[PDB]
Amino acid sequence: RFLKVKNWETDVVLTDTLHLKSTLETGCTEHICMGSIMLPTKDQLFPLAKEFLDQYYSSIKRFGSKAHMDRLEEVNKEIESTSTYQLKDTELIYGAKHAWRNASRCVGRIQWSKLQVFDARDCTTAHGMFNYICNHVKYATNKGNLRSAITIFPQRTDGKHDFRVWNSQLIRYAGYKQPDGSTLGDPANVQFTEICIQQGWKAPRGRFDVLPLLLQANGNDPELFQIPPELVLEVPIRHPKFDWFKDLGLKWYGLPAVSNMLLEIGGLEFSACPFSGWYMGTEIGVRDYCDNSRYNILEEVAKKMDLDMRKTSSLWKDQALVEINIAVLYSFQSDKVTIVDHHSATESFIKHMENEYRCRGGCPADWVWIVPPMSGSITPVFHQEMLNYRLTPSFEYQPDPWNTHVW
Amino acid sequence: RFLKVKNWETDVVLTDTLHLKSTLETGCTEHICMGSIMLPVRTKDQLFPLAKEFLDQYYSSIKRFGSKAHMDRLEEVNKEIESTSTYQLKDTELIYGAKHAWRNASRCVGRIQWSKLQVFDARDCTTAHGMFNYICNHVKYATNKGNLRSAITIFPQRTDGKHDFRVWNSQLIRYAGYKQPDGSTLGDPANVQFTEICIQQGWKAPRGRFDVLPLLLQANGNDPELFQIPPELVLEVPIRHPKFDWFKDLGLKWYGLPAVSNMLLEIGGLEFSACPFSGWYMGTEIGVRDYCDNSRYNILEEVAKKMDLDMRKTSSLWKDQALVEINIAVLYSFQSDKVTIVDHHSATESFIKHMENEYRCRGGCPADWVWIVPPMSGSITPVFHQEMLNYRLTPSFEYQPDPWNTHVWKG
Ligand code: HEM
Ligand code: HEM
Ligand SMILES: NCc1cccc(OCc2ccc3ccc(N)nc3c2)c1
Ligand SMILES: NCc1cccc(OCc2ccc3ccc(N)nc3c2)c1
Ligand SMILES: C[C@H](O)[C@H](O)[C@H]1CNc2nc(N)[nH]c(=O)c2N1
Ligand SMILES: C[C@H](O)[C@H](O)[C@H]1CNc2nc(N)[nH]c(=O)c2N1
Ligand SMILES: [Zn+2]
């Protein structure tokens, strides 16, 4: 019931007790582990509220205080009466930071307590959402000195008045299915680039077009908005060695801003809660550039390096992969845009993990996601045993809106 | 109950039914996943259903389920269990068992090869000297002048747990490691503790950087004895790089044959505590883990210096760069000397084909993503994007505690 995790490079053993406060489920049973699966009423509500208020009031050294009991009473009264309840700003901020702190797949959690929370619960229209999102983008970007932030739109009431950002990220590059058969731009965004083109967007059918925003307020049909280019910080990709690298025609945006997740605090559901940090270099260079079902230019880069691409055993893909990631990092660092290499971030995470074991009794972590997509075993997280479990408040996945939307 | 796995790169969806035949526990619960944890005397009472389960599988595989051969074998085993409190496998059952143990090894990426295993029955062995002979023959057969062949040698099963056969070496061939007074290590830091035992047992250490460790062999529960593998049986490969000529002067080499020797083979409730098996290396085992793990030979630094890399910021990825060239050199050296090896691109691609075949022909393929994905360049291999299900099937290879921690000393 008290679990120990071992690091095999250092022999350090940590003891986990925090898992015992887990409430949601893993998908795993005693007979089968699903660790590598990517996507595993008034009476429901009060225990959920109680649990949260209990941990909130504990965090401020006022468990079993009049205020705590008062608040529990007030919330209880609101629930029976109104069929939902409203979070105080302090609770909203606490809940958002803890949803990040609890994100078992996030390697960047050492930064969890420094999150700027934007209360957008007074928003009523897509134009309102656009304004809030522009402000978020401007604030988070900070001329390249990136700052973590989240903007929270009104909570679900009854499933018919959902606020939803249809984009998966605030800033992404378009992708179009051509008649030649291949693909122009970002292959991940093909179906989405289509729906924009459908919904009225004029695609400049190019390769690196910043997608428009598709915003759904109060359950209504979604609306297109172009983000002001001066708010979209982009980074030209060059190599500190291959002068031919710039000729490839590659750039990327500085702000990773995930916008399709659901934020759960005290039983309440926030279906629209875009949040942003800054990139780990491998997200762009390994996944975004060199994945097959993405920009997939490993082949092209190796060509210009004149590597032997006849046999896989020359490791030309590995050689190219590294140089590319050197460039991404180089380009961002030159342009003074915040970025972290996977060696620094994983080192940071080990320290965060030990801090959390020390001050909280645990840190839920998903090894499958925490270990970087290149050079895994030369990073410290590879030899670190992790325990994965679901704590609340939390970020959850939700279905794409188009599959769901009652038009 | 059916379970689906999806490949996020191809959108191929497979359906698993095999997991229903799973018995052993994972460690996980609906409250927690222990998927990243490395390592989370048997009464006749529980032995018979284990034997029956195995015999049912066996006679199904040969299309004789419910046959008189099946039923008589069942009765024969039953009687032997209530009489002698254990039983003996036929050679045929033993070979099936060992092959299926490998087929069931969820952490093994090389399983496309599972049906080609040479099984050596060493169950008539009684002494450490006999163990040395069987192991020598295994090494010679498996090495095959560089044309490696998968093999397993199986020593007598456990009885009361007081007469165990054990190979104390973690692998049949490994380099010594010596802790120096100044805190630095000579040779392989992974083998320091074992090297000490050997030395204590009477081994005269050459105290070099690449000394092949002696075999420490325990028969029938007696104290282990030291043997030297004839050096002509240990095929080794000098490591050089195809473009960097200074690489040879690092003085590196590695042995050709990976032969894991500390695992326990379980078949039908029987436990074979000494069952050394061998295949061939995936390049990253040597070049990423053996050479570049900070807790092993750890030569990234010296390789990086000689490459004249920007070693100041990690963000130069000097570690990643050196890691690649080292792995190129390992593959190059082995191919050039015509010693069997496989790169991680080839091996993972083959595993995907194997896994798809297993889903079709068998209903599933237990796989441990944490172990299947290679320790470098993970996402540019096809296994990275593959959902996998992990569960435990028998026959199986299990971990067991190091023998020096459990052995009752005779004198
Ligand atoms: C500030 C620097 C940050 C860094 C370096 C970072 C890094 C990462 C990385 C590399 C991943 C894996 C994502 C992938 O491979 O697709 C990830 C996942 C994730 N991050 Fe962080 N992140 C940061 C900030 C944040 C913030 C501010 C939040 C929330 C407020 C957050 C919440 C999450 C969540 C929920 C996931 C998992 C998403 C999923 O389950 O699919 N991260 N992060
Ligand atoms: C023939 C070529 C083979 C290749 C290329 C191969 C590859 C691998 C690799 C790379 C690992 C991960 C090891 C690590 O990183 O520590 C592994 C694990 C494993 N292999 Fe295979 N293998 C082969 C043959 C075999 C054979 C012949 C057997 C048994 C008869 C076997 C049984 C296992 C088992 C039980 C594990 C799990 C080890 C553990 O749980 O610690 N493999 N294999
Ligand atoms: N890959 C599937 C999928 C679906 C939905 C969200 C998601 O999250 C990826 C993600 C989430 C948050 C991040 C925060 C910062 C960052 N640099 N990357 C981040 C990447 C991933
Ligand atoms: N690292 C923990 C540990 C402890 C004991 C054995 C072991 O085996 C790893 C292993 C097992 C079988 C293998 C078969 C072939 C091969 N090339 N490598 C292989 C590597 C691993
Ligand atoms: C903590 C983690 O379980 C441990 O370091 C594992 C990770 N994956 C691995 N994968 C392979 N193939 N071999 C290993 O030794 C390990 N070590
Ligand atoms: C099949 C597998 O679960 C899938 O490819 C996962 C693996 N690990 C990952 N790890 C991170 N950080 N991000 C990812 O998108 C994925 N994808
Ligand atoms: Zn699990």
Tokens 């007081």 correspond to B162
- Measure A75 CA to nearest chain B CA, in Å: 28
The one-character DSSP state at A303 is H
Which CATH architecture fits B236-258+281-346? Alpha-Beta Complex (3.90)
Separation of alpha carbons A342 and A5, rounded Å: 22
Burial of A268 (0-12, 13-18, 19+ CB in 10 A): buried
Residue among A37, A344, A374 minimizing CB distance to B376? A374
Q: Yes or no: say if B246 and B164 are a contact pair by the CB < 8 Å rule.
A: no
Scan for tokens 């003891």, then name that residue: A15
Q: Is A186 helix (H, G, I), strand (E, B) or coil?
A: coil
> Is the CB of residue A268 less than 8 Å from the CB of residue A394?
no
Strand ranges, E, within A113-189:
116-119, 149-152, 164-165, 175-177, 183-185
CA A354 – CA B164 distance, rounded (Å) = 41
CATH superfamily, domain at B16-123+150-160+264-278+348-372: Nitric Oxide Synthase; Chain A, domain 1 (3.90.340.10)
Query: How many other CB atoms are there within 10 angstroms of residue B200's CB atom?
Result: 8
What gap in Å lies between CA A151 and CA B137, rounded to an integer?
Answer: 69
Neighbours of B7 (CB within 10 A): 18
How many CB atoms are closer than 10 A to CB B341?
26
Interchain contact, A375 vs B376, CB within 8 Å:
yes
Q: Tell the residue nearest (CA) to atom 15 of ligand 4.
A: B279
What is the rounded CA–CA span in Å between residue A259 and residue A271?
A: 9
Residue A270 Cβ inside 6 Å of ligand 1? The answer reads: no
**Closest Cα partner for B156 from B73, B103, B212, B88?**
B88
Is ligand 4 within 6 A of the CB of residue B279?
yes
C-beta separation of A272 from A164 below 8 A: yes
Q: Which residues of B touch A30 (CB under 8 A)?
A: 25-26, 28-29
Q: A234-256+279-344 adopts what CATH topology?
A: 3.90.1230
Look at the block and give the residue holding tokens 């067991």: B400
Q: Where are the beta strands (DSSP E) in A7-148?
A: 13-16, 116-119
CA distance B181 to B35: 39
In terms of phi and psi (left: phi > 0; alpha: psi -120 to 50; beta: otherwise), the region of B34 is alpha
Residue A377: phi, psi to the nearest 5? -85, -10
Out of B33, B38, B289, mutate this one to test ligand 5's pocket (max ligand atoms within 8 Å of CB): namely B38
Tokens 């237990």, residue located: B366
Tokens of A385: 């045993």
Tell me if B109 sits within 8 A of B343, measured CB to CB.
Answer: no
Number of C-beta neighbours around residue B220 at 10 A: 16
Q: How many CB pairs under 8 A join A and B?
A: 209
What CATH homologous superfamily does B124-149+164-235+399-403 map to? Answer: Nitric Oxide Synthase;Heme Domain;Chain A domain 2 (3.90.440.10)
**Residue B268 β-bridge partners:** none
Tokens of A81: 């009466």
Rounded to 10 degrees, what is the CA torsion of B129, B130, B131, B134? 130
Q: Give me the amino acid identity at A394.
A: S
Active centre residues of B (catalytic): 108, 111, 280, 285
End-to-end alpha-carbon separation of chain B, Å? Answer: 56
Distance from residue A104's CA to the centre of ligand 1 (Å): 9
Q: For ligand 3, pick from A258, A271, A337, A346 the residue to mutate: most ligand atoms within 8 Å of CB.
A: A258
Question: At how many Å resolution was this determined?
Answer: 1.9
Task: With H, G, I as helix, E, B as strand and everything else as coil, classify residue A159.
Answer: coil
Task: Detail the residues of A annotated as belonging to a binding site for L-arginine.
Answer: 169, 278-279, 283
| Domain ranges for chain A | 16-121+148-158+262-276+346-370, 122-147+162-233+397-401, 234-256+279-344
Query: Would you say A387 and A19 are in contact if contact means Cβ atoms under 8 Å apart?
Result: yes
Of A381, A143, A386, A152, the residue nearest A278 (C-alpha)? A143
Reported as type and span, the H/E element at residue A354 is: helix A342-359
After which residues is chain A discontinuous, taking C to N > 2.5 Å?
A: 40
- Bridge partners of A164? A216
User: Positive or negative, the Cα torsion across B134, B137, B139, B141?
Assistant: negative
Question: In Å, how far is B295's CA from the nearest CA of chain A?
Answer: 6
Give the helix ranges, DSSP H, for A175-315: 190-199, 281-282, 298-304
**DSSP, res A287:** I
Residue B274 has phi, psi (to 5 degrees) of: -130, 110
Active-site residue, from A100, A106, A196, A264 = A106
Contacts 24+ apart (CB under 8 A), A63-70: none
* Distance, CA of A146 to CA of A232 (rounded, Å): 12
What are the residues facing B253 on neighbouring strands? B238
Please, how many CA atoms are within 13 Å of residue A29, restricted to the half-sphere of its CB? Answer: 11
Give the tokens for residue A25: 């489920």
Contact (CB, 8 A) for B190 and B296:
yes
Return phi, psi of residue A2, to 5°.
Answer: -115, 115
In this structure, are residues B139 and B258 in contact, taking their beta carbons and an 8 Å threshold? no
DSSP designation for A279: E
CA of A38 to the centre of ligand 3 (A): 12
DSSP line for A306-353 = T---S-GGG-HHHHHHHHHHHHHHHHHHHTT--EE-HHHHHHHHHHHH
Structure tokens at B186: 């000579």
Mutate to test the pocket of ligand 5, among B370, B372, B377, B390 (most ligand atoms within 8 A of CB): B370
Tell me if A29 sits within 8 A of B23, measured CB to CB. no
Is B286 in contact with B321 (CB distance < 8 Å)? Answer: no
Pair B101, B395: CB distance under 8 Å: yes
Contacts (Cβ under 8 Å, ≥6 apart) of B249:
none
- Cβ–Cβ < 8 Å for B135, B127: no
Ligand 1 atom closest to residue A150's alpha carbon, by position in its atom list: 30
Beta strands in A145-300 (DSSP E): 149-152, 164-165, 175-177, 183-185, 213-216, 223-225, 234-236, 251-253, 257-258, 262-265, 268-270, 275-276, 279-280
Residue with tokens 């940071």: A348
Angle value at C-alpha B310, between B305 and B313, nearest 5 degrees: 120
What gap in Å lies between CA B68 and CA B55, rounded to an integer?
13
CATH superfamily of A122-147+162-233+397-401: Nitric Oxide Synthase;Heme Domain;Chain A domain 2 (3.90.440.10)
For residue A283, give the DSSP letter. I
Cis peptide before B276 (omega within 30 of 0): no
Q: Are A72 and A78 in contact (CB under 8 A)?
A: no
With CA atoms as reference, the chain B residue closest to A27 would be B30
Nearest to B289 by CA among B280, B302, B299, B276: B299
Q: Token match 């320790």: residue?
A: B375
**One-letter amino acid for residue B353 of the chain:** K
Site of tokens 């505690």: B401
Question: Cβ contacts (< 8 Å) between A371 and chain B: which residues?
Answer: 378
Tokens for A48, please give them: 């959920």
CB neighbours of residue B100 within 10 Å: 22
| Distance, CA of A323 to chain centre | 26
CATH superfamily of A16-121+148-158+262-276+346-370: Nitric Oxide Synthase; Chain A, domain 1 (3.90.340.10)
Cβ B294–A9 below 8 Å, yes or no?
yes
Token digits for B98? 């060992």
Handedness of CA A237, A240, A243, A244 (dihedral sign): negative
Secondary structure string (H, E, C) spanning chain B: CCEEEEECCCCCEEEECHHHHCCCCCCCCCCCECCCCCCCCCCHHHHHHHHHHHHHHHHHHCCCCCCHHHHHHHHHHHHHHHHHCCCCCCHHHHHHHHHHHHHCCCCCCCHHHCCCCEEEECCCCCCHHHHHHHHHHHHHHHHHHHCCCCEEEECCCCCCCCCCCEECCCECCCECEEECCCCCEEECHHHHHHHHHHHHCCCCCCCCCCCECCEEEECCCCCCEEECCCHHHCCEEECCCCCCCHHHHHCCEEECCCEECCCEEEECCEEECCCCEECCEEHHHHHHHHHHCCCCCCCHHHHHHHCCCCCCCHHHCHHHHHHHHHHHHHHHHHHHCCCCEECHHHHHHHHHHHHHHHHHHHCCCCCCHHHHCCCCCHHHCCCCCECCCECCCCCEEECCCCHHHCCCCCC
Q: Whose CA is nearest to atom 5 of ligand 5?
A: A383
Torsion of CA A278, A281, A282, A288, to 10 degrees: 70
Q: Do residues A255 and A233 make contact, with C-beta atoms less than 8 angstroms apart?
A: yes
Instruction: Report the interhelical angle of B44-61 vs B91-103 (nearest 10°).
Output: 90
Distance separating alpha carbons of residues B356 and A348, to the nearest angstrom: 38
User: In chain A, what is the straight-line distance between the N-terminal and C-terminal CA atoms, in Å?
Assistant: 49
